[PDB]
Amino acid sequence: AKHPVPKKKTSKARRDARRSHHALTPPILVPCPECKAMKPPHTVCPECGYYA
Amino acid sequence: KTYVPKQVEPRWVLIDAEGKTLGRLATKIATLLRGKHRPDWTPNVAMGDFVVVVNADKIRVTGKKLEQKIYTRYSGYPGGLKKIPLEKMLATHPERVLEHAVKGMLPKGPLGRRLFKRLKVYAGPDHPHQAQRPEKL
Amino acid sequence: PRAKTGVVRRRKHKKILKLAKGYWGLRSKSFRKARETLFAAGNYAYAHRKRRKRDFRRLWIVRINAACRQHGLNYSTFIHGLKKAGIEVDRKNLADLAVREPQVFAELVERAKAAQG
Amino acid sequence: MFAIVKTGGKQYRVEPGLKLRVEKLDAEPGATVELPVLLLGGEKTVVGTPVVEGASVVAEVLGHGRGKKILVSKFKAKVQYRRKKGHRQPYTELLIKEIRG
Amino acid sequence: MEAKAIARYVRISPRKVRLVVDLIRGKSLEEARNILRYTNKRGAYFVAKVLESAAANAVNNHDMLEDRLYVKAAYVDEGPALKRVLPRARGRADIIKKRTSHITVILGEKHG
RNA sequence: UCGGGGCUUAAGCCCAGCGCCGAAGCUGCGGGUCUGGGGGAUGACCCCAGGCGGUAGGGGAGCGUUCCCGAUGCCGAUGAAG
RNA sequence: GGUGAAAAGAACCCCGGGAGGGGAGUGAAAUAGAGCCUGAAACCGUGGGCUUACAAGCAGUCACGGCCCCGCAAGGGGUUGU
Ligand SMILES: [Mg+2]
Ligand SMILES: [Mg+2]
Ligand SMILES: [Mg+2]
Ligand SMILES: [Mg+2]
Ligand SMILES: [Mg+2]
Ligand SMILES: [Mg+2]
Ligand SMILES: [Mg+2]
Ligand SMILES: [Mg+2]
Ligand SMILES: [Mg+2]
Ligand SMILES: [Mg+2]
Ligand SMILES: [Mg+2]
Ligand SMILES: [Mg+2]
Ligand SMILES: [Mg+2]
Ligand SMILES: [Mg+2]
Ligand SMILES: [Mg+2]
Ligand SMILES: [Mg+2]
Ligand SMILES: [Mg+2]
Ligand SMILES: [Mg+2]
Ligand SMILES: [Mg+2]
Ligand SMILES: [Mg+2]
Ligand SMILES: [Mg+2]
Ligand SMILES: [Mg+2]
Ligand SMILES: [Mg+2]
Ligand SMILES: [Mg+2]
Ligand SMILES: [Mg+2]
Ligand SMILES: [Mg+2]
Ligand SMILES: [Mg+2]
Ligand SMILES: [Mg+2]
Ligand SMILES: [Mg+2]
Ligand SMILES: [Mg+2]
Ligand SMILES: [Mg+2]
Ligand SMILES: [Mg+2]
Ligand SMILES: [Mg+2]
Ligand SMILES: [Mg+2]
Ligand SMILES: [Mg+2]
Ligand SMILES: [Mg+2]
Ligand SMILES: [Mg+2]
Ligand SMILES: [Mg+2]
Ligand SMILES: [Mg+2]
Ligand SMILES: [Mg+2]
Ligand SMILES: [Mg+2]
């Protein structure tokens, strides 16, 4: 408001372009040795446990 | 309805250099980079012969151009204007001085820049003896 | 009797957005941006229809002069020759002969040569 | 064989048997017309003097018609001035028969 | 064949749920169940929940086999926004749009 | 930085000459409109010539929207308006 | 301000805490499903075709070329490289 403000509506082009790096990435997962299910590596998870 | 050529074929050519007046020669070279001599001239495709110059380190030039004529060169920074005289061009990179001319005589667009790539200048000769090479004058 | 705007305005707008299909961004979606674009478009074409005459007036001349010089003479002379001999043929375009049907060009060359001297 | 011919103001290369639309003509919708105008041939026949001194090319007129409309727009800015016209040029279609000449 | 499911009027901005949807478009059902299971986003919960329903329909309504169905396609569309005022400095007031989403997942048999 | 490249018995200046390129100017071909003259006993229509950049502004001819007469009519479920 | 001729306003089963859906069912029609006739535009999204990472722009126009699509054909439509 006070002082600076956009000089022009951003085009739907430039807008979406800015957003080119917004996409997510799937979580890193590995099949836990004990159970069959998936776990995030280096972590314990329910429906399972650990050795000592 | 006017004719339109098909996929041509790169005619190569071999030009001398010694004794040739820089600009005078530069003209002919350009007209060869474009078609303009090939009657199937097509201004949007590029099919002008490949040109290969040799012994460019020997080009003639009138007046006192060797000291008078100086090439400018701007870098983005302040005072970035460089003033290199002809004498120093040939003394160092000499194939350079032939380029700064023909390039300056080619069209400006994206095609023009492709044409520049069809030019091969050396101080030698001893250019890479690929294939065609019909010397001219 | 009241005559509300009704359909009239929509149809006139819609009728122009058609005309403006394929234009970049708003120039093809907004009626107002469209009309503006179309204005220039009409003038650009009208001016280019006059241009197209010259776009070939040239192309041919080069192509002619091109093959023309293979035979040792230049366009400006070639025409002096042809025009001298009264050979009003070869409306520049038809001097595509330089391309296909070369011999005939070579013929016209000698004719023009003999005419001039 | 090749044959340069003049009509409707423009010139045209012509082959035996060849469909070709040209500037409108006043002629039966099927009649035969020699374009008595002719220059050159497929075997060299330069029209030294303007026309070929004695020859011509036969052609039956397919029919008549009007070309696709062209919108001629005129617009002068700052000055509330616009004009719009639809133009459709007429043209008689031709079928080249003989090069006899 | 194919079996769809749609959760309409979900109180959550579409721009934000869309990220999670893009994350599982065309992947297996088992793959998605895991992806959405460990994706860190409020949107996952919703997209997962509609994903699950899309399965039951596939099976309990269209015979298709769980052991081999995937996300043929998916997408979110924006529904009507709840607008609210918002007191601002010097007495001015802004409206703030609490937006909303229609989430859609469509499944299909793996191969044939 | 002469627009640039580049140019020196010139691609500079002066004097002479033959060419060619070059506009939406002029010609060719087709068409429109107006105006005038002519044929048309004829409206219709045909022929010939000429005019047709345009702001303020004057004049002329049309297009669409709502409603009324034409309607105790006519179209409409084999599909109205949109 | 407007479901439909009529509530015949969707029993029952399925996923879900609910919302909301998917089937089943009513109806001439459910994309008439309940702020429900018609449902335009801006605006957001999914899929498909053409296109783009050496390129200088009032975003178009003119020409040629490539790809994709229509028709036996001459041809036409979309896109855009120079
Ligand atoms: Mg000096
Ligand atoms: Mg370009
Ligand atoms: Mg450009
Ligand atoms: Mg009004
Ligand atoms: Mg202007
Ligand atoms: Mg102005
Ligand atoms: Mg100069
Ligand atoms: Mg002299
Ligand atoms: Mg009269
Ligand atoms: Mg009278
Ligand atoms: Mg005038
Ligand atoms: Mg006027
Ligand atoms: Mg006045
Ligand atoms: Mg009137
Ligand atoms: Mg009646
Ligand atoms: Mg009836
Ligand atoms: Mg019925
Ligand atoms: Mg009927
Ligand atoms: Mg119907
Ligand atoms: Mg009405
Ligand atoms: Mg009720
Ligand atoms: Mg239900
Ligand atoms: Mg609870
Ligand atoms: Mg319910
Ligand atoms: Mg159902
Ligand atoms: Mg039924
Ligand atoms: Mg129906
Ligand atoms: Mg139904
Ligand atoms: Mg409908
Ligand atoms: Mg309905
Ligand atoms: Mg509602
Ligand atoms: Mg609504
Ligand atoms: Mg009704
Ligand atoms: Mg819409
Ligand atoms: Mg897309
Ligand atoms: Mg590609
Ligand atoms: Mg570009
Ligand atoms: Mg530029
Ligand atoms: Mg295809
Ligand atoms: Mg066909
Ligand atoms: Mg383009």
Short mmCIF file of all heavy atoms in Angstrom, two decimals, chain G residues 2 5 9-10 14 17 23 26 32 36 45 51 55 63-64 67 77 81:
data_model
loop_
_atom_site.label_atom_id
_atom_site.label_comp_id
_atom_site.label_asym_id
_atom_site.label_seq_id
_atom_site.Cartn_x
_atom_site.Cartn_y
_atom_site.Cartn_z
P G G 2 -36.62 -18.95 -6.10
OP1 G G 2 -36.65 -20.09 -5.14
OP2 G G 2 -35.31 -18.53 -6.67
"O5'" G G 2 -37.66 -19.21 -7.27
"C5'" G G 2 -38.92 -19.83 -7.02
"C4'" G G 2 -39.23 -20.85 -8.06
"O4'" G G 2 -39.65 -20.15 -9.26
"C3'" G G 2 -38.04 -21.73 -8.44
"O3'" G G 2 -38.27 -23.13 -8.18
"C2'" G G 2 -37.77 -21.46 -9.93
"O2'" G G 2 -37.67 -22.62 -10.73
"C1'" G G 2 -38.92 -20.57 -10.40
N9 G G 2 -38.44 -19.36 -11.09
C8 G G 2 -37.69 -18.38 -10.48
N7 G G 2 -37.32 -17.42 -11.27
C5 G G 2 -37.83 -17.78 -12.50
C6 G G 2 -37.74 -17.10 -13.74
O6 G G 2 -37.17 -16.04 -14.01
N1 G G 2 -38.39 -17.79 -14.75
C2 G G 2 -39.04 -18.98 -14.57
N2 G G 2 -39.61 -19.50 -15.67
N3 G G 2 -39.14 -19.63 -13.41
C4 G G 2 -38.51 -18.98 -12.41
P A G 5 -43.59 -29.99 -15.31
OP1 A G 5 -44.05 -30.75 -16.51
OP2 A G 5 -43.20 -28.57 -15.48
"O5'" A G 5 -44.65 -30.13 -14.13
"C5'" A G 5 -45.89 -29.42 -14.17
"C4'" A G 5 -47.07 -30.36 -14.07
"O4'" A G 5 -47.03 -31.33 -15.15
"C3'" A G 5 -47.16 -31.20 -12.81
"O3'" A G 5 -47.73 -30.49 -11.73
"C2'" A G 5 -47.99 -32.39 -13.25
"O2'" A G 5 -49.37 -32.07 -13.24
"C1'" A G 5 -47.55 -32.56 -14.70
N9 A G 5 -46.50 -33.59 -14.85
C8 A G 5 -45.29 -33.44 -15.49
N7 A G 5 -44.55 -34.52 -15.49
C5 A G 5 -45.33 -35.46 -14.82
C6 A G 5 -45.11 -36.81 -14.50
N6 A G 5 -44.00 -37.47 -14.82
N1 A G 5 -46.09 -37.46 -13.84
C2 A G 5 -47.20 -36.78 -13.52
N3 A G 5 -47.53 -35.51 -13.77
C4 A G 5 -46.54 -34.90 -14.43
P G G 9 -40.73 -40.46 -3.02
OP1 G G 9 -39.95 -40.25 -4.26
OP2 G G 9 -40.47 -41.68 -2.22
"O5'" G G 9 -40.64 -39.18 -2.08
"C5'" G G 9 -40.37 -37.89 -2.63
"C4'" G G 9 -38.91 -37.52 -2.49
"O4'" G G 9 -38.70 -36.20 -3.09
"C3'" G G 9 -38.39 -37.41 -1.06
"O3'" G G 9 -37.01 -37.75 -1.03
"C2'" G G 9 -38.55 -35.92 -0.77
"O2'" G G 9 -37.75 -35.44 0.28
"C1'" G G 9 -38.14 -35.33 -2.12
N9 G G 9 -38.65 -33.98 -2.36
C8 G G 9 -39.76 -33.40 -1.82
N7 G G 9 -39.95 -32.17 -2.22
C5 G G 9 -38.88 -31.92 -3.08
C6 G G 9 -38.56 -30.76 -3.81
O6 G G 9 -39.15 -29.68 -3.85
N1 G G 9 -37.40 -30.93 -4.55
C2 G G 9 -36.66 -32.07 -4.58
N2 G G 9 -35.58 -32.01 -5.36
N3 G G 9 -36.95 -33.17 -3.90
C4 G G 9 -38.07 -33.03 -3.17
P A G 10 -36.31 -38.22 0.34
OP1 A G 10 -37.37 -38.33 1.36
OP2 A G 10 -35.18 -37.31 0.59
"O5'" A G 10 -35.76 -39.67 -0.03
"C5'" A G 10 -36.62 -40.67 -0.54
"C4'" A G 10 -35.93 -41.52 -1.57
"O4'" A G 10 -35.81 -40.78 -2.81
"C3'" A G 10 -34.50 -41.93 -1.24
"O3'" A G 10 -34.43 -43.05 -0.38
"C2'" A G 10 -33.88 -42.16 -2.61
"O2'" A G 10 -34.24 -43.44 -3.11
"C1'" A G 10 -34.59 -41.10 -3.45
N9 A G 10 -33.80 -39.86 -3.56
C8 A G 10 -33.93 -38.75 -2.77
N7 A G 10 -33.11 -37.79 -3.10
C5 A G 10 -32.39 -38.29 -4.17
C6 A G 10 -31.37 -37.75 -4.96
N6 A G 10 -30.87 -36.52 -4.77
N1 A G 10 -30.87 -38.51 -5.96
C2 A G 10 -31.37 -39.73 -6.13
N3 A G 10 -32.33 -40.36 -5.45
C4 A G 10 -32.81 -39.57 -4.47
P C G 14 -24.04 -52.19 4.27
OP1 C G 14 -23.33 -53.21 5.08
OP2 C G 14 -24.75 -51.09 4.97
"O5'" C G 14 -23.05 -51.59 3.17
"C5'" C G 14 -22.24 -52.45 2.38
"C4'" C G 14 -21.41 -51.68 1.38
"O4'" C G 14 -22.27 -51.00 0.43
"C3'" C G 14 -20.54 -50.56 1.95
"O3'" C G 14 -19.33 -51.03 2.50
"C2'" C G 14 -20.36 -49.64 0.76
"O2'" C G 14 -19.37 -50.14 -0.12
"C1'" C G 14 -21.72 -49.75 0.08
N1 C G 14 -22.64 -48.69 0.51
C2 C G 14 -22.64 -47.48 -0.17
O2 C G 14 -21.84 -47.35 -1.11
N3 C G 14 -23.49 -46.50 0.22
C4 C G 14 -24.32 -46.71 1.25
N4 C G 14 -25.14 -45.74 1.61
C5 C G 14 -24.34 -47.94 1.95
C6 C G 14 -23.50 -48.89 1.56
P G G 17 -15.17 -43.10 9.73
OP1 G G 17 -14.07 -42.66 10.62
OP2 G G 17 -15.38 -44.55 9.52
"O5'" G G 17 -16.54 -42.41 10.18
"C5'" G G 17 -17.22 -42.83 11.35
"C4'" G G 17 -17.77 -41.66 12.12
"O4'" G G 17 -16.69 -40.79 12.52
"C3'" G G 17 -18.72 -40.75 11.36
"O3'" G G 17 -20.05 -41.25 11.33
"C2'" G G 17 -18.59 -39.44 12.12
"O2'" G G 17 -19.33 -39.48 13.32
"C1'" G G 17 -17.10 -39.45 12.47
N9 G G 17 -16.28 -38.74 11.47
C8 G G 17 -15.28 -39.31 10.71
N7 G G 17 -14.70 -38.47 9.90
C5 G G 17 -15.33 -37.26 10.15
C6 G G 17 -15.11 -35.99 9.56
O6 G G 17 -14.29 -35.66 8.69
N1 G G 17 -15.97 -35.04 10.09
C2 G G 17 -16.92 -35.28 11.06
N2 G G 17 -17.65 -34.22 11.43
N3 G G 17 -17.13 -36.46 11.61
C4 G G 17 -16.31 -37.40 11.12
P G G 23 -22.66 -44.84 -10.14
OP1 G G 23 -22.16 -44.79 -11.53
OP2 G G 23 -23.74 -43.91 -9.73
"O5'" G G 23 -23.06 -46.33 -9.75
"C5'" G G 23 -24.42 -46.76 -9.80
"C4'" G G 23 -24.64 -47.97 -8.92
"O4'" G G 23 -24.35 -47.63 -7.54
"C3'" G G 23 -26.07 -48.49 -8.88
"O3'" G G 23 -26.39 -49.31 -9.99
"C2'" G G 23 -26.11 -49.22 -7.55
"O2'" G G 23 -25.45 -50.48 -7.65
"C1'" G G 23 -25.26 -48.30 -6.68
N9 G G 23 -26.08 -47.30 -6.00
C8 G G 23 -26.09 -45.95 -6.23
N7 G G 23 -26.94 -45.32 -5.47
C5 G G 23 -27.51 -46.32 -4.69
C6 G G 23 -28.50 -46.24 -3.69
O6 G G 23 -29.08 -45.23 -3.27
N1 G G 23 -28.79 -47.49 -3.16
C2 G G 23 -28.21 -48.67 -3.55
N2 G G 23 -28.62 -49.78 -2.92
N3 G G 23 -27.29 -48.75 -4.49
C4 G G 23 -26.99 -47.55 -5.01
P U G 26 -38.29 -47.66 -10.42
OP1 U G 26 -39.47 -48.48 -10.77
OP2 U G 26 -37.18 -47.55 -11.39
"O5'" U G 26 -38.75 -46.20 -9.96
"C5'" U G 26 -39.78 -46.03 -8.99
"C4'" U G 26 -40.16 -44.58 -8.84
"O4'" U G 26 -39.05 -43.84 -8.27
"C3'" U G 26 -40.49 -43.83 -10.12
"O3'" U G 26 -41.82 -44.06 -10.55
"C2'" U G 26 -40.21 -42.38 -9.74
"O2'" U G 26 -41.29 -41.84 -8.99
"C1'" U G 26 -39.02 -42.53 -8.80
N1 U G 26 -37.73 -42.34 -9.50
C2 U G 26 -37.32 -41.06 -9.82
O2 U G 26 -38.00 -40.09 -9.57
N3 U G 26 -36.11 -40.96 -10.44
C4 U G 26 -35.27 -42.00 -10.77
O4 U G 26 -34.21 -41.76 -11.33
C5 U G 26 -35.74 -43.29 -10.40
C6 U G 26 -36.92 -43.41 -9.79
P A G 32 -30.49 -31.69 -17.01
OP1 A G 32 -30.72 -33.10 -17.42
OP2 A G 32 -30.23 -30.67 -18.07
"O5'" A G 32 -31.68 -31.19 -16.06
"C5'" A G 32 -32.01 -31.90 -14.88
"C4'" A G 32 -32.90 -31.09 -13.98
"O4'" A G 32 -34.29 -31.27 -14.37
"C3'" A G 32 -32.87 -31.46 -12.51
"O3'" A G 32 -31.79 -30.87 -11.81
"C2'" A G 32 -34.24 -31.01 -12.01
"O2'" A G 32 -34.25 -29.61 -11.79
"C1'" A G 32 -35.11 -31.31 -13.22
N9 A G 32 -35.74 -32.65 -13.13
C8 A G 32 -35.46 -33.78 -13.86
N7 A G 32 -36.19 -34.82 -13.54
C5 A G 32 -37.02 -34.34 -12.54
C6 A G 32 -38.03 -34.94 -11.78
N6 A G 32 -38.40 -36.21 -11.92
N1 A G 32 -38.67 -34.19 -10.86
C2 A G 32 -38.30 -32.91 -10.72
N3 A G 32 -37.37 -32.23 -11.37
C4 A G 32 -36.76 -33.01 -12.28
P C G 36 -29.01 -24.04 -6.52
OP1 C G 36 -27.79 -24.68 -5.96
OP2 C G 36 -28.95 -22.59 -6.87
"O5'" C G 36 -29.55 -24.88 -7.76
"C5'" C G 36 -30.93 -24.83 -8.14
"C4'" C G 36 -31.43 -26.19 -8.56
"O4'" C G 36 -31.97 -26.89 -7.42
"C3'" C G 36 -32.56 -26.20 -9.57
"O3'" C G 36 -32.11 -26.04 -10.91
"C2'" C G 36 -33.21 -27.57 -9.33
"O2'" C G 36 -32.52 -28.58 -10.05
"C1'" C G 36 -32.97 -27.79 -7.84
N1 C G 36 -34.18 -27.58 -7.04
C2 C G 36 -34.85 -28.71 -6.57
O2 C G 36 -34.39 -29.82 -6.85
N3 C G 36 -35.96 -28.57 -5.84
C4 C G 36 -36.42 -27.35 -5.56
N4 C G 36 -37.53 -27.25 -4.83
C5 C G 36 -35.76 -26.18 -6.02
C6 C G 36 -34.65 -26.33 -6.75
P G G 45 -5.69 -23.23 -12.83
OP1 G G 45 -4.43 -23.49 -12.09
OP2 G G 45 -5.62 -22.56 -14.15
"O5'" G G 45 -6.54 -24.58 -12.95
"C5'" G G 45 -6.45 -25.59 -11.95
"C4'" G G 45 -7.38 -26.74 -12.23
"O4'" G G 45 -8.66 -26.26 -12.71
"C3'" G G 45 -6.94 -27.73 -13.29
"O3'" G G 45 -5.96 -28.64 -12.83
"C2'" G G 45 -8.26 -28.40 -13.67
"O2'" G G 45 -8.61 -29.39 -12.71
"C1'" G G 45 -9.25 -27.24 -13.55
N9 G G 45 -9.56 -26.62 -14.85
C8 G G 45 -9.18 -25.38 -15.28
N7 G G 45 -9.61 -25.10 -16.47
C5 G G 45 -10.32 -26.22 -16.86
C6 G G 45 -11.02 -26.50 -18.07
O6 G G 45 -11.14 -25.78 -19.07
N1 G G 45 -11.60 -27.77 -18.05
C2 G G 45 -11.52 -28.64 -17.00
N2 G G 45 -12.14 -29.82 -17.16
N3 G G 45 -10.87 -28.39 -15.87
C4 G G 45 -10.30 -27.17 -15.86
P U G 51 4.85 -29.93 -33.60
OP1 U G 51 5.86 -30.01 -34.68
OP2 U G 51 4.75 -31.05 -32.64
"O5'" U G 51 5.01 -28.55 -32.81
"C5'" U G 51 5.06 -27.31 -33.50
"C4'" U G 51 5.12 -26.13 -32.55
"O4'" U G 51 4.00 -26.19 -31.63
"C3'" U G 51 6.33 -26.06 -31.64
"O3'" U G 51 7.48 -25.54 -32.28
"C2'" U G 51 5.84 -25.19 -30.50
"O2'" U G 51 5.83 -23.82 -30.88
"C1'" U G 51 4.39 -25.66 -30.37
N1 U G 51 4.25 -26.72 -29.35
C2 U G 51 4.26 -26.31 -28.04
O2 U G 51 4.37 -25.14 -27.72
N3 U G 51 4.14 -27.31 -27.11
C4 U G 51 4.02 -28.66 -27.37
O4 U G 51 3.92 -29.44 -26.42
C5 U G 51 4.02 -29.00 -28.76
C6 U G 51 4.14 -28.05 -29.68
P A G 55 17.60 -18.74 -31.78
OP1 A G 55 16.90 -20.05 -31.72
OP2 A G 55 17.80 -18.09 -33.09
"O5'" A G 55 16.91 -17.72 -30.77
"C5'" A G 55 15.49 -17.60 -30.72
"C4'" A G 55 15.06 -16.57 -29.69
"O4'" A G 55 15.75 -16.82 -28.44
"C3'" A G 55 15.40 -15.13 -30.01
"O3'" A G 55 14.50 -14.51 -30.90
"C2'" A G 55 15.44 -14.50 -28.63
"O2'" A G 55 14.13 -14.39 -28.10
"C1'" A G 55 16.17 -15.59 -27.87
N9 A G 55 17.62 -15.48 -28.06
C8 A G 55 18.29 -15.33 -29.25
N7 A G 55 19.59 -15.26 -29.14
C5 A G 55 19.78 -15.37 -27.78
C6 A G 55 20.95 -15.36 -27.00
N6 A G 55 22.18 -15.23 -27.51
N1 A G 55 20.78 -15.48 -25.67
C2 A G 55 19.54 -15.60 -25.18
N3 A G 55 18.37 -15.63 -25.80
C4 A G 55 18.58 -15.50 -27.11
P A G 63 -0.59 -14.76 -47.73
OP1 A G 63 -1.39 -14.97 -48.96
OP2 A G 63 -1.11 -15.27 -46.44
"O5'" A G 63 0.89 -15.28 -47.95
"C5'" A G 63 1.64 -14.86 -49.08
"C4'" A G 63 3.03 -15.44 -49.06
"O4'" A G 63 3.78 -14.88 -47.95
"C3'" A G 63 3.11 -16.94 -48.83
"O3'" A G 63 2.87 -17.69 -50.01
"C2'" A G 63 4.52 -17.12 -48.28
"O2'" A G 63 5.48 -17.07 -49.32
"C1'" A G 63 4.66 -15.85 -47.43
N9 A G 63 4.32 -16.09 -46.02
C8 A G 63 3.10 -15.92 -45.40
N7 A G 63 3.11 -16.23 -44.12
C5 A G 63 4.42 -16.63 -43.89
C6 A G 63 5.07 -17.08 -42.73
N6 A G 63 4.47 -17.20 -41.56
N1 A G 63 6.38 -17.40 -42.83
C2 A G 63 6.98 -17.28 -44.02
N3 A G 63 6.48 -16.87 -45.18
C4 A G 63 5.17 -16.55 -45.04
P C G 64 2.24 -19.16 -49.91
OP1 C G 64 1.76 -19.51 -51.26
OP2 C G 64 1.28 -19.15 -48.79
"O5'" C G 64 3.50 -20.05 -49.53
"C5'" C G 64 4.62 -20.14 -50.39
"C4'" C G 64 5.86 -20.62 -49.67
"O4'" C G 64 6.19 -19.70 -48.60
"C3'" C G 64 5.73 -21.96 -48.96
"O3'" C G 64 5.85 -23.07 -49.83
"C2'" C G 64 6.84 -21.88 -47.92
"O2'" C G 64 8.11 -22.06 -48.52
"C1'" C G 64 6.71 -20.42 -47.50
N1 C G 64 5.77 -20.27 -46.37
C2 C G 64 6.28 -20.45 -45.08
O2 C G 64 7.49 -20.70 -44.97
N3 C G 64 5.45 -20.33 -44.02
C4 C G 64 4.16 -20.06 -44.22
N4 C G 64 3.37 -19.95 -43.15
C5 C G 64 3.62 -19.89 -45.52
C6 C G 64 4.45 -20.01 -46.57
P C G 67 5.39 -33.40 -42.47
OP1 C G 67 5.91 -34.76 -42.74
OP2 C G 67 4.49 -32.76 -43.47
"O5'" C G 67 4.71 -33.36 -41.03
"C5'" C G 67 5.37 -33.88 -39.89
"C4'" C G 67 4.61 -33.59 -38.62
"O4'" C G 67 4.53 -32.16 -38.41
"C3'" C G 67 3.16 -34.05 -38.60
"O3'" C G 67 3.02 -35.42 -38.29
"C2'" C G 67 2.54 -33.12 -37.57
"O2'" C G 67 2.88 -33.55 -36.26
"C1'" C G 67 3.28 -31.82 -37.85
N1 C G 67 2.55 -30.97 -38.82
C2 C G 67 1.32 -30.41 -38.46
O2 C G 67 0.86 -30.64 -37.33
N3 C G 67 0.66 -29.63 -39.35
C4 C G 67 1.20 -29.40 -40.55
N4 C G 67 0.52 -28.63 -41.40
C5 C G 67 2.45 -29.96 -40.94
C6 C G 67 3.08 -30.72 -40.05
P G G 77 -9.39 -22.78 -44.01
OP1 G G 77 -10.03 -21.50 -43.63
OP2 G G 77 -8.00 -22.77 -44.51
"O5'" G G 77 -9.53 -23.83 -42.82
"C5'" G G 77 -10.72 -23.92 -42.06
"C4'" G G 77 -10.55 -24.79 -40.84
"O4'" G G 77 -10.25 -26.15 -41.25
"C3'" G G 77 -9.39 -24.45 -39.92
"O3'" G G 77 -9.65 -23.34 -39.07
"C2'" G G 77 -9.19 -25.75 -39.17
"O2'" G G 77 -10.23 -25.96 -38.23
"C1'" G G 77 -9.37 -26.75 -40.31
N9 G G 77 -8.09 -27.02 -40.98
C8 G G 77 -7.67 -26.57 -42.21
N7 G G 77 -6.46 -26.98 -42.51
C5 G G 77 -6.08 -27.74 -41.41
C6 G G 77 -4.87 -28.44 -41.15
O6 G G 77 -3.87 -28.54 -41.88
N1 G G 77 -4.90 -29.08 -39.92
C2 G G 77 -5.96 -29.04 -39.03
N2 G G 77 -5.80 -29.71 -37.88
N3 G G 77 -7.09 -28.39 -39.25
C4 G G 77 -7.07 -27.77 -40.45
P G G 81 7.29 -21.11 -33.21
OP1 G G 81 7.60 -21.79 -31.92
OP2 G G 81 6.86 -19.69 -33.18
"O5'" G G 81 8.51 -21.29 -34.22
"C5'" G G 81 9.39 -22.39 -34.12
"C4'" G G 81 10.16 -22.58 -35.40
"O4'" G G 81 9.30 -23.19 -36.39
"C3'" G G 81 10.67 -21.30 -36.06
"O3'" G G 81 11.92 -20.88 -35.55
"C2'" G G 81 10.70 -21.65 -37.54
"O2'" G G 81 11.90 -22.33 -37.87
"C1'" G G 81 9.53 -22.63 -37.66
N9 G G 81 8.28 -21.97 -38.11
C8 G G 81 7.24 -21.59 -37.31
N7 G G 81 6.25 -21.06 -37.98
C5 G G 81 6.66 -21.12 -39.30
C6 G G 81 6.01 -20.70 -40.49
O6 G G 81 4.90 -20.17 -40.62
N1 G G 81 6.77 -20.94 -41.61
C2 G G 81 8.01 -21.52 -41.60
N2 G G 81 8.59 -21.68 -42.79
N3 G G 81 8.64 -21.92 -40.51
C4 G G 81 7.91 -21.69 -39.40
#
